[PDB]
C-alpha cells in the first residue's frame, strides 16, 4: 500500500491535491495522483524531475528530468526513454484528475539506480500542455504548472 504522501502546489502556491506511491508488485512504482484546479478536458505533460524542491513560480528549482539511464525524452523517440517520463494526465470536465499509473522505471529502495527517494529527493511536475512523447528535453510540454516534492 500507498505512502510517501506528497502535497501538490501550483504556480501560485495553492494546495491542489496529492500524490502517494506504492512499491509495486510489480514492478517499479504505482503513482496515485489526485489533483484539482487544472484546465478542463486538457491532456497535460507529467514527469518526475531529479530534485525534491517545489519553489514558485516556475519550479526550475528543481531539476532534472529523472534520467539515471541517460536516455533522451519520450515514449515515441527511437532514442527515448527517461525513467521519469509518465503518460499525459487527462483532465476531467471537473478540472480534476484522480488516477493510478505505473512508473516502471523507478524505485524507493536505497541503493537502486532508479531510486527516486534519495537524499536530494525528486519532484512530480504537471505541465501546461501535452507532452508529444518525442521532442527533447520534455516533449514540448511547456511551462511546469504543478509540483509536488518527494523528500526523505
Ligand atoms: Cl521529461
Ligand atoms: Zn522526459
Ligand atoms: Zn484517488
UniProtKB/Swiss-Prot annotation:
Cofactor(s) required, per the database record: Zn(2+)
Major site of localization recorded for this protein: membrane
Subcellular location: Cell membrane
Entry's Gene Ontology molecular function annotations: copper ion binding; identical protein binding; superoxide dismutase activity; zinc ion binding
Cysteines joined through disulfide linkages: 54-147
Membrane topology term: Lipid-anchor
Protein name: Superoxide dismutase-like protein YojM
Organism phylogeny: Bacteria, Bacillati, Bacillota, Bacilli, Bacillales
Boundaries of the shown chain within the full protein: 40 to 191 of 196
